[PDB]
Tab-separated table of C-alpha atoms in Angstrom:
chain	number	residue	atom	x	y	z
A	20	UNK	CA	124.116	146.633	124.376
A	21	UNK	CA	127.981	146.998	124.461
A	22	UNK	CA	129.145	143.251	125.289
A	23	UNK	CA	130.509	141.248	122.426
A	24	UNK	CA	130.170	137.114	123.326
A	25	UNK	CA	131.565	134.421	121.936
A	26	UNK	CA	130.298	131.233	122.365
A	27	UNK	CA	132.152	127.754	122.353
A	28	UNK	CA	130.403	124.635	120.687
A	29	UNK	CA	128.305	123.776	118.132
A	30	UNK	CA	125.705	121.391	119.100
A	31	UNK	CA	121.479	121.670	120.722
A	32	UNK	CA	122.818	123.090	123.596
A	33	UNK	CA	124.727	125.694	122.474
A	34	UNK	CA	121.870	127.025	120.032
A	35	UNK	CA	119.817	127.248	122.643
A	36	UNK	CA	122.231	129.424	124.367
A	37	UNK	CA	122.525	131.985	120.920
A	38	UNK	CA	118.817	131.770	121.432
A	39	UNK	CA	118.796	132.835	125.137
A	40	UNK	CA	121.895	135.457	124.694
A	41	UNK	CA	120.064	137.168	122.027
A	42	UNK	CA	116.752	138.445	124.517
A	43	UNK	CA	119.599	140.512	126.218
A	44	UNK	CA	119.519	144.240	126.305
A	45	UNK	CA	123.652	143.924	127.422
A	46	UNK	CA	124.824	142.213	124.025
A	47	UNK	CA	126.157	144.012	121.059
A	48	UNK	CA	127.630	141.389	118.666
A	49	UNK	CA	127.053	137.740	119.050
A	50	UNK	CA	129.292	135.059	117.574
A	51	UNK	CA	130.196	131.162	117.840
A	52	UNK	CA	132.383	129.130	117.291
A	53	UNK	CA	132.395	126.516	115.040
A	54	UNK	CA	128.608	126.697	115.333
A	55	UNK	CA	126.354	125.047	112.459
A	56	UNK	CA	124.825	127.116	109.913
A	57	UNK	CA	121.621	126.136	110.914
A	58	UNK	CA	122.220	128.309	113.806
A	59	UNK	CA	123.667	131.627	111.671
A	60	UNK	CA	120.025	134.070	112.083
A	61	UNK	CA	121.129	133.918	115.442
A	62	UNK	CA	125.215	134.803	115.205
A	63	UNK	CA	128.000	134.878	113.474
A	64	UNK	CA	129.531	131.614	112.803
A	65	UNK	CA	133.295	131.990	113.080
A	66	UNK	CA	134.916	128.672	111.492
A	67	UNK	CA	138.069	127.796	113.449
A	68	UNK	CA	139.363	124.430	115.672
A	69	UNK	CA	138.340	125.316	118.781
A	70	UNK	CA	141.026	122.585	120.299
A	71	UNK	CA	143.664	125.354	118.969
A	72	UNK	CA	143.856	128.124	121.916
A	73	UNK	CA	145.529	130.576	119.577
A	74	UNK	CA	142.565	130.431	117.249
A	75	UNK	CA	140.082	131.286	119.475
A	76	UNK	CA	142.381	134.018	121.178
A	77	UNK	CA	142.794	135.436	117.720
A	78	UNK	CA	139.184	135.379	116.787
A	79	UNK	CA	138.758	137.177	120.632
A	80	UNK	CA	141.221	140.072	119.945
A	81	UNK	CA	140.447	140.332	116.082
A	82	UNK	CA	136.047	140.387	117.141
A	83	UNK	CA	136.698	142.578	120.412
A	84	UNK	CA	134.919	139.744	122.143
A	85	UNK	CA	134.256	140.929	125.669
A	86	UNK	CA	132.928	137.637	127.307
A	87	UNK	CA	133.223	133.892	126.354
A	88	UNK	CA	130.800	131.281	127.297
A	89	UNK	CA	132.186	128.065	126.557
A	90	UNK	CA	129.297	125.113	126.004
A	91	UNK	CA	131.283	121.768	125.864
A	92	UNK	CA	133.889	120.310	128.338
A	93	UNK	CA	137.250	119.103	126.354
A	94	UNK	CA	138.241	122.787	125.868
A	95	UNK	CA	137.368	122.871	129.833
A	96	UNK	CA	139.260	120.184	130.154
A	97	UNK	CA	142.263	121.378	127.548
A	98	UNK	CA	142.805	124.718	129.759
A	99	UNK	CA	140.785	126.876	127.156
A	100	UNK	CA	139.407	129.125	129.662
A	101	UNK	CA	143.126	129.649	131.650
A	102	UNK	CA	144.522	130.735	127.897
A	103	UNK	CA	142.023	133.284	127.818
A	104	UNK	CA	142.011	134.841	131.106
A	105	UNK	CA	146.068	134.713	130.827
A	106	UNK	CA	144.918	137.316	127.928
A	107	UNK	CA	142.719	139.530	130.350
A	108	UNK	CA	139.534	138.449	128.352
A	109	UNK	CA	136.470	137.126	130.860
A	110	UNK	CA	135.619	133.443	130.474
A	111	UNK	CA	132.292	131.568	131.467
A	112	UNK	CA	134.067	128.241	132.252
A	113	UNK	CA	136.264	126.521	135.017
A	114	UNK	CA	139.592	126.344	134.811
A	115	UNK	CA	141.678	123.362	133.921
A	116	UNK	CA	142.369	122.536	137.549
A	117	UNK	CA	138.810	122.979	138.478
A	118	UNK	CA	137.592	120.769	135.885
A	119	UNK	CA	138.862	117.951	137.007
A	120	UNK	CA	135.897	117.517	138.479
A	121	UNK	CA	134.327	116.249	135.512
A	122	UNK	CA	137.367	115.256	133.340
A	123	UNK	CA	138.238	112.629	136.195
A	124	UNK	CA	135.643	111.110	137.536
A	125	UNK	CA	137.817	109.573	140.471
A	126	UNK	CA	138.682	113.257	141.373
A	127	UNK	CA	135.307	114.122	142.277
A	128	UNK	CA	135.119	111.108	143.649
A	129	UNK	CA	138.074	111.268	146.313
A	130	UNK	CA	137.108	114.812	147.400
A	131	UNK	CA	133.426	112.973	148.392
A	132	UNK	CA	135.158	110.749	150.625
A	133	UNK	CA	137.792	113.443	151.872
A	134	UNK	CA	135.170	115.875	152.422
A	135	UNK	CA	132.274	114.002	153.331
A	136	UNK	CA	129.893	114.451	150.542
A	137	UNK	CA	127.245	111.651	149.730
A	138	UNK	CA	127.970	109.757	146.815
A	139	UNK	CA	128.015	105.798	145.705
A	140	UNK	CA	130.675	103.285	147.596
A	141	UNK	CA	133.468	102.837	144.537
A	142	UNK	CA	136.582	102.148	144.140
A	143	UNK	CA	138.937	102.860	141.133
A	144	UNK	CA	141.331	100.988	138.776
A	145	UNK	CA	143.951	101.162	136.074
A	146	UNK	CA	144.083	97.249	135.450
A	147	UNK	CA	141.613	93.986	135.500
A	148	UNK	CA	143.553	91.929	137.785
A	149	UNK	CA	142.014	94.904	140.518
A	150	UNK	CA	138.695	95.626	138.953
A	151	UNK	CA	137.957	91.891	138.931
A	152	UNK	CA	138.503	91.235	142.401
A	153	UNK	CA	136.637	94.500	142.994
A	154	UNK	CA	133.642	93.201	140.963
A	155	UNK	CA	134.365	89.519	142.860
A	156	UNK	CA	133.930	90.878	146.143
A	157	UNK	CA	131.388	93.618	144.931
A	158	UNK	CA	127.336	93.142	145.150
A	159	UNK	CA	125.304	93.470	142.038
A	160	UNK	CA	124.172	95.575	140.370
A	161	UNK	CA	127.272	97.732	140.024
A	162	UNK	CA	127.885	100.596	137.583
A	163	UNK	CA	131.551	100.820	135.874
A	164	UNK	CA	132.742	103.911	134.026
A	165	UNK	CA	135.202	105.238	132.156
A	166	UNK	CA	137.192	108.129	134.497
A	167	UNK	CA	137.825	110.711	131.760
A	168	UNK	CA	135.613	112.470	129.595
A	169	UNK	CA	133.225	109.868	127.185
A	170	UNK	CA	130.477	111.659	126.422
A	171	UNK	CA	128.176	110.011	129.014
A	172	UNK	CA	128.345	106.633	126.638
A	173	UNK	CA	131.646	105.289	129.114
A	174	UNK	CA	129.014	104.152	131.437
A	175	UNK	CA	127.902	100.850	131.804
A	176	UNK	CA	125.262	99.249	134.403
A	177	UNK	CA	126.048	95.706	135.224
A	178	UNK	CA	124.009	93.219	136.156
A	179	UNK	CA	125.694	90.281	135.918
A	180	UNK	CA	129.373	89.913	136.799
A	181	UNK	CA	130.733	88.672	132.909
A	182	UNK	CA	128.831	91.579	131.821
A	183	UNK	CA	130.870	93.933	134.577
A	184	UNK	CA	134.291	91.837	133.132
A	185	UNK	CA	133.267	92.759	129.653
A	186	UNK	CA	132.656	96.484	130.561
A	187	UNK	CA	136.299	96.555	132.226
A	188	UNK	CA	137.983	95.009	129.208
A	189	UNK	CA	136.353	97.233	127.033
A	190	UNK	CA	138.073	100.548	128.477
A	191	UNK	CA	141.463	99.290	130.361
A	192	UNK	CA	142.879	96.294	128.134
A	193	UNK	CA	140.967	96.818	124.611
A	194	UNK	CA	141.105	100.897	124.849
A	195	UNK	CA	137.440	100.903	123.397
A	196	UNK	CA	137.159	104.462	124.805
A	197	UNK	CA	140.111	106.293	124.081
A	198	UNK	CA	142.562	107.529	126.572
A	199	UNK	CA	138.849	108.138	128.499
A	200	UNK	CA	138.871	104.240	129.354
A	201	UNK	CA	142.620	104.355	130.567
A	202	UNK	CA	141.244	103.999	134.163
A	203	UNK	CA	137.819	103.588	135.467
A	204	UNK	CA	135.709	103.197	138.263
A	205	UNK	CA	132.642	101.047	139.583
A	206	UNK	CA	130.158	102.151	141.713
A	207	UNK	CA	127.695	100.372	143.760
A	208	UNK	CA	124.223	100.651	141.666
A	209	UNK	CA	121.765	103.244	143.337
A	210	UNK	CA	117.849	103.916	143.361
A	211	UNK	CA	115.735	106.460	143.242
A	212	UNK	CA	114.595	109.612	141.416
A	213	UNK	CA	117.406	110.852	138.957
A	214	UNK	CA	117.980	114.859	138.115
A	215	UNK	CA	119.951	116.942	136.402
A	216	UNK	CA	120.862	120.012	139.107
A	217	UNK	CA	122.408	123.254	137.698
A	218	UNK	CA	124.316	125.325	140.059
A	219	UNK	CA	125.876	128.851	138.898
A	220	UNK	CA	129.592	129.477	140.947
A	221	UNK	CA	131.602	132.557	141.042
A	222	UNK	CA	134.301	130.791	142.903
A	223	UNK	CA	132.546	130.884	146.578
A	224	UNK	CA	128.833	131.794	145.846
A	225	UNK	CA	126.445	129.130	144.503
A	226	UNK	CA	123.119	130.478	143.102
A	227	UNK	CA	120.692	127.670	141.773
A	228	UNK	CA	119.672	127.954	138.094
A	229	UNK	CA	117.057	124.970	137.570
A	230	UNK	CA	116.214	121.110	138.155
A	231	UNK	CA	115.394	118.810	134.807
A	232	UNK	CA	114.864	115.419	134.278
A	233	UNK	CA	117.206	113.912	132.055
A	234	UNK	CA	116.650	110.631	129.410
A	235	UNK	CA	120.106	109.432	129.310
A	236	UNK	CA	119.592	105.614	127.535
A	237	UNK	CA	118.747	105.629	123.933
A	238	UNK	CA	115.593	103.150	124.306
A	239	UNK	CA	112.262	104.315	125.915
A	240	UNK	CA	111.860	103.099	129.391
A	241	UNK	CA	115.325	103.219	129.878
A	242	UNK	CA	116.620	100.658	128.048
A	243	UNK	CA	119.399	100.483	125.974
A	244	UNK	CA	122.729	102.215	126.118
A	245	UNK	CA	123.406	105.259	127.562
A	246	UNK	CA	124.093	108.235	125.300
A	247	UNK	CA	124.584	111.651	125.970
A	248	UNK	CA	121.072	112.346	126.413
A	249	UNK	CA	118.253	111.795	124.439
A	250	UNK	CA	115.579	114.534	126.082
A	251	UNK	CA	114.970	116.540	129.288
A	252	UNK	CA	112.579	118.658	130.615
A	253	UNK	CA	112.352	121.092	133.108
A	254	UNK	CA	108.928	122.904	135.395
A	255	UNK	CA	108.479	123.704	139.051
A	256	UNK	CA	108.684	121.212	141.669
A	257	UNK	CA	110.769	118.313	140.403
A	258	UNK	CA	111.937	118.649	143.954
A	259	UNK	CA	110.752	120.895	146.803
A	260	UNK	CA	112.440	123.441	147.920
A	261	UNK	CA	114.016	122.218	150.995
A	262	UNK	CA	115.805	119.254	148.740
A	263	UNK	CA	116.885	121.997	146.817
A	264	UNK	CA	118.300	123.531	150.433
A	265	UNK	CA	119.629	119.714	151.289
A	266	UNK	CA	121.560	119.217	148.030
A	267	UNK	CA	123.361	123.130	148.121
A	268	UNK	CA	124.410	122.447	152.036
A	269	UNK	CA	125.443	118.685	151.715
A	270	UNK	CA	126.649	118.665	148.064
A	271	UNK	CA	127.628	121.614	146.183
A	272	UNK	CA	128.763	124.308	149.104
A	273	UNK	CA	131.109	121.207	150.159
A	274	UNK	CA	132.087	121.400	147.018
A	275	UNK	CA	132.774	124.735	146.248
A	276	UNK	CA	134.350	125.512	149.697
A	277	UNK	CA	136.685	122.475	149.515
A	278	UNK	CA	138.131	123.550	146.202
A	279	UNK	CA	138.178	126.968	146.961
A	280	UNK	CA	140.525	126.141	149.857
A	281	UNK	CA	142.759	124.003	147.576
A	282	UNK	CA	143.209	126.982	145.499
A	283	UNK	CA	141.453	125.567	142.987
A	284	UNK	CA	138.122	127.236	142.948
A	285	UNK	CA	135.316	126.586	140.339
A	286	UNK	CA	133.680	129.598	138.533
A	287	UNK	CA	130.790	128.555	135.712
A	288	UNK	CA	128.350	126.324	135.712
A	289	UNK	CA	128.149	123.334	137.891
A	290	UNK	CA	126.336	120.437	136.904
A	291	UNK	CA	125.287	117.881	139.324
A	292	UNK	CA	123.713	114.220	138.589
A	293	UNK	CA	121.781	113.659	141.908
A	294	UNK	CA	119.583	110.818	142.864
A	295	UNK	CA	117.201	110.969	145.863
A	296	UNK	CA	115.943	108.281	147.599
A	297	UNK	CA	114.115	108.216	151.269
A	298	UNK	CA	114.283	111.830	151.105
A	299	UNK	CA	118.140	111.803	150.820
A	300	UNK	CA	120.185	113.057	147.958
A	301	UNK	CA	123.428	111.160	146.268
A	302	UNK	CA	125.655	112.492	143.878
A	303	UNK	CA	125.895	110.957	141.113
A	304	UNK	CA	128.523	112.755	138.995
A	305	UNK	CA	130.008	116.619	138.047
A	306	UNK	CA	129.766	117.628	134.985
A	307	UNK	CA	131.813	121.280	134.753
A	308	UNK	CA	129.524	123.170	132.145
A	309	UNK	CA	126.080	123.318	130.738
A	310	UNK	CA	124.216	119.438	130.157
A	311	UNK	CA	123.246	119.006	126.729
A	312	UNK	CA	120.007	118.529	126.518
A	313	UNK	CA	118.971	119.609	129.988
A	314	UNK	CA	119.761	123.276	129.184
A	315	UNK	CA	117.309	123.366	126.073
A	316	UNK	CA	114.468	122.819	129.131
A	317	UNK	CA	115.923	124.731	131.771
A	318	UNK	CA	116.320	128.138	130.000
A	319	UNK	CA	113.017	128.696	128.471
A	320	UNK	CA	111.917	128.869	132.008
A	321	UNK	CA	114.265	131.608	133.037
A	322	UNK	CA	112.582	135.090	133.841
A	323	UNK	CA	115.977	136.581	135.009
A	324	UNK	CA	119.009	137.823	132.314
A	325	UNK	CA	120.543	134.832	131.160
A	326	UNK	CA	123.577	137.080	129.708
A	327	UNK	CA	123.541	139.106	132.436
A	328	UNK	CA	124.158	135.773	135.087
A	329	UNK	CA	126.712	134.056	132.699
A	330	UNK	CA	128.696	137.706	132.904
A	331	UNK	CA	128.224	138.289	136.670
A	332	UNK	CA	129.525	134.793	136.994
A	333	UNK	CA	132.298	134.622	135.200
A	334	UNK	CA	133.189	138.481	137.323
A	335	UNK	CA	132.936	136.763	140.293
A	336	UNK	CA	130.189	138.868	141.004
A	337	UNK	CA	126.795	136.450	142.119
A	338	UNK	CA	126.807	137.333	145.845
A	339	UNK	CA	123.895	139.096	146.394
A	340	UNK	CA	122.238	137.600	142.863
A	341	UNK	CA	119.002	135.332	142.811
A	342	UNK	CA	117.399	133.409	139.626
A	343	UNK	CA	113.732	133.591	138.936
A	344	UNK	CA	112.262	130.980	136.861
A	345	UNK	CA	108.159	131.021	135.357
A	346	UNK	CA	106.007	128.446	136.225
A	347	UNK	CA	105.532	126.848	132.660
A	348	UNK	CA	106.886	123.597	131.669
A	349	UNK	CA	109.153	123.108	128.988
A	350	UNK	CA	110.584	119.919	127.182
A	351	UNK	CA	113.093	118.867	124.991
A	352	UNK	CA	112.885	116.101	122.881
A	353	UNK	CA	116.146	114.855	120.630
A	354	UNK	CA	116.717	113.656	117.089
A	355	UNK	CA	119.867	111.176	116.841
A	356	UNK	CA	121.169	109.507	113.546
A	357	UNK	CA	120.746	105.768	113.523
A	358	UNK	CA	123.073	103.900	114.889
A	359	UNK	CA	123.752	106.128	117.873
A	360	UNK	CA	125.061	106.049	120.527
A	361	UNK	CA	127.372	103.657	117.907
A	362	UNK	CA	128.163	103.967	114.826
A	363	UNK	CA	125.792	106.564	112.803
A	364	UNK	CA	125.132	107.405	109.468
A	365	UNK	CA	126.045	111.099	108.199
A	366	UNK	CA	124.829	112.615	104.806
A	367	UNK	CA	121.201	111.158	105.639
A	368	UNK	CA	118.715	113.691	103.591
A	369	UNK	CA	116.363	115.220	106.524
A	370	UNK	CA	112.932	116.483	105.414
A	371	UNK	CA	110.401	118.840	107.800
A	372	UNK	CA	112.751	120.620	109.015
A	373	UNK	CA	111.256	124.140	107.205
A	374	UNK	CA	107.410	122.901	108.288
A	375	UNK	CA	108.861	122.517	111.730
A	376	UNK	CA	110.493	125.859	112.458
A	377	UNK	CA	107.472	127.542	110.682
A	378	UNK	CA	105.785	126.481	113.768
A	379	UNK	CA	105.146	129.408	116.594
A	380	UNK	CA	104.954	127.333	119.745
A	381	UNK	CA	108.118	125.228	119.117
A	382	UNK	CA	111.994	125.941	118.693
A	383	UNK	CA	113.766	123.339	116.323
A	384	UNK	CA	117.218	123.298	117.242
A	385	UNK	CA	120.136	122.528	114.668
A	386	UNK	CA	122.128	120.021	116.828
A	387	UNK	CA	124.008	118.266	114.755
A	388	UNK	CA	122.660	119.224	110.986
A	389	UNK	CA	124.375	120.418	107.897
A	390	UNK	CA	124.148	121.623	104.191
A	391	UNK	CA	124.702	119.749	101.220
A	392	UNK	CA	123.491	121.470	98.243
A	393	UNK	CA	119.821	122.021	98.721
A	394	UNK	CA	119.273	119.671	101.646
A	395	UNK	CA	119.670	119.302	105.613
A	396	UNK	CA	121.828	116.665	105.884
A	397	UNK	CA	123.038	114.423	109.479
A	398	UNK	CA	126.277	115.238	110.855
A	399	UNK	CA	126.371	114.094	114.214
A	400	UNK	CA	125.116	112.000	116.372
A	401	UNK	CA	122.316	114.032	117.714
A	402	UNK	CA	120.885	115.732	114.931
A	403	UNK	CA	117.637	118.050	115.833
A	404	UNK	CA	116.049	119.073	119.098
A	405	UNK	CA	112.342	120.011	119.442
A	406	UNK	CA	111.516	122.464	122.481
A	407	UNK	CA	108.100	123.739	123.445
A	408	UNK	CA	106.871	125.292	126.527
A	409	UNK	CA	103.452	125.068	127.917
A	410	UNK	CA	101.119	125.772	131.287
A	411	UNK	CA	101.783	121.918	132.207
A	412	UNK	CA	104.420	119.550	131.050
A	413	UNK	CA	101.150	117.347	129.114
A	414	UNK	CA	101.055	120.140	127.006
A	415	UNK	CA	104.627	120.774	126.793
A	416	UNK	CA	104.529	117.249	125.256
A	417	UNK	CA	101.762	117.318	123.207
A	418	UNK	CA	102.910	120.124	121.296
A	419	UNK	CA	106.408	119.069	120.907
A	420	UNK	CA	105.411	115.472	119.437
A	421	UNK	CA	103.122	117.283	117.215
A	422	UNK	CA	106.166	119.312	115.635
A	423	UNK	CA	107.872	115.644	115.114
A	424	UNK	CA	105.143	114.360	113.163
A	425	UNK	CA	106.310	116.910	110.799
A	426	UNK	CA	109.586	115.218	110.270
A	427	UNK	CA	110.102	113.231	107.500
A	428	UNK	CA	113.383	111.342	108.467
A	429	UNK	CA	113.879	107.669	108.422
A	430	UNK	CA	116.759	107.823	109.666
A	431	UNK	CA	115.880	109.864	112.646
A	432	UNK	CA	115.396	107.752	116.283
A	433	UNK	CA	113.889	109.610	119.454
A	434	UNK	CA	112.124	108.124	122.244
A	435	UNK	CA	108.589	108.702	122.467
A	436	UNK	CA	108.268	108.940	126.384
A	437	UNK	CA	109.637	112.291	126.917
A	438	UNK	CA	107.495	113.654	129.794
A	439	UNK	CA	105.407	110.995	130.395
A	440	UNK	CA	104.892	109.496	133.741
């Protein structure tokens, strides 16, 4: 190969990516940046702040890097990928303008109603005088969230309205959130089945890349907070192929027309929450990259050149392109530090990790780990990821559980119903 990539992130999802880039016969030199040494038999990890454009420019011309693929969404959001095609060098990632589709929530949620794309009844606020009245008129339950980019952990389902007032205090008047919670929205609470859809877009041609289900609360049977994620998986027939059909007609080619027409047009990956219920699809939310930990599920299944559709992409070059994923299940299941989605402890000693990723079946993922002296150490929130594939998603789960029992971590909380029913 003759393409030198550079990838953007350092976390589960962006290891799996190195691993993924790496089966291609177009790559030459791979890189990222900041990475995790954990990750470093894969690529070259290329310390720099990543929130500095000029860095990563720098580390482009001074690497020759041909392509970069860009895993996490506040350099989306921070115009990373405009900087670098203002250079000439080919991004995977939406610009600025288009990701505003993620990095306001009440963007994406205005061009639903402008456009007619289905989505939950909302309304949006900058002050509790508004959202109070909202919530006073409003039925229950009703979802509020933070319009700007939290993580996923800026959403809140309410079931009660002093719960609802809390949740709005939180992010507009005590700023729990950041400049994230400066404004917000609430949503009318919707049922059904919950998936994670991932689109590829060159601009004006959507090509489907994979369904997963998604485990976004910290708790088993969804209880607890939401994080930002705690597992996925991914295997044929989450949905049939005509809701596949359904959500690309009434959801994303909406989507991608209307901001194509503004000018605006989206080129990367597209990320759709979706909910279906009596055969209908709703969106939930855009996210304007790769999901983190859906992608650690969705790629193992991928037949096609994962290199090869992240370049044709970012070319503008998917018209006549397909994806072809196996049949096999695969399944993800997360690590996180204690305390998370909250407050976490870092510097925890983490044991098993060497009995883990001696095993052949699985793929440990270095998340969130780091050295100190002779140990693997927490350093985020979510610390380890544990893939495995199988001929059904039973034994997709069987064998990545298995691999956990090798863990010798107190300090290590995952949710045991990953794949199960």
């Amino acid at each position: 190969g003759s393409m030198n990539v550079l990838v953007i992130g350092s976390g589960g999802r962006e290891h799996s990516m190195l691993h993924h880039i790496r089966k291609s016969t177009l790559l030459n030199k791979l890189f990222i940046a900041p990475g995790r040494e954990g990750m470093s038999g894969l690529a070259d990890i290329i310390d720099i702040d990543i929130n500095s454009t000029i860095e990563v420019i720098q580390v482009c011309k001074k690497e020759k890097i041909e392509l970069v693929v860009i895993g996490p969404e506040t350099p989306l959001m921070n115009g990373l990928s405009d900087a670098l095609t203002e250079e000439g060098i080919l991004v995977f990632g939406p610009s600025k303008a288009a990701a505003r589709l993620e990095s306001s929530k009440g963007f994406t949620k205005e061009l639903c109603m402008r456009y007619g794309i289905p989505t939950a009844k909302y309304g949006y606020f900058v002050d509790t005088n508004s959202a109070y009245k909202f919530i006073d008129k409003h039925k229950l339950p009703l979802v509020v969230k933070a319009d700007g980019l939290a993580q996923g952990k800026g959403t809140v389902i309410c079931h009660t309205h002093e719960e609802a007032y809390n949740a709005v205090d939180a992010m507009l008047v005590h700023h729990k959130f950041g400049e994230a919670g400066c404004a917000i929205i609430i949503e009318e609470f919707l049922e059904g089945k919950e998936i994670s859809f991932f689109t590829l877009v060159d601009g004006s041609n959507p090509v489907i890349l994979g369904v997963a289900q998604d485990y976004k609360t910290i708790g088993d049977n969804n209880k607890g907070p939401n994080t930002g994620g705690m597992g996925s998986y991914s295997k044929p027939n989450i949905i049939t192929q005509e809701m596949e059909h359904i959500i690309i007609q009434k959801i994303i080619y909406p989507t991608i027309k209307a901001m194509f027409n503004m000018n605006i047009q989206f080129r990367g990956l597209l990320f759709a929450g979706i909910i279906i219920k009596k055969n209908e699809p709703k969106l939930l939310e855009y996210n304007v990259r790769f999901g983190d930990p859906e992608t650690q599920s969705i790629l193992p299944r991928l037949n096609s050149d994962f290199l090869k559709l992240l370049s044709l992409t970012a070319k503008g070059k998917l018209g006549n392109e397909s994806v072809e994923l196996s049949k096999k299940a695969a399944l993800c299941v997360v690590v996180a530090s204690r305390g998370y989605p909250g407050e976490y402890k870092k510097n925890s000693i983490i044991n098993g990790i060497e009995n883990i990723e001696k095993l052949p079946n699985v793929q440990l993922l270095h998340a969130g780990t780091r050295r100190e002296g002779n140990n693997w150490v927490s350093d985020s929130g979510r610390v380890i990821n544990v893939v495995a594939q199988g001929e059904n998603l039973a034994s997709a789960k069987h064998q990545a559980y298995a691999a956990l029992d090798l863990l010798d971590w107190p300090d290590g909380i995952y949710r045991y119903d990953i794949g199960s029913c």
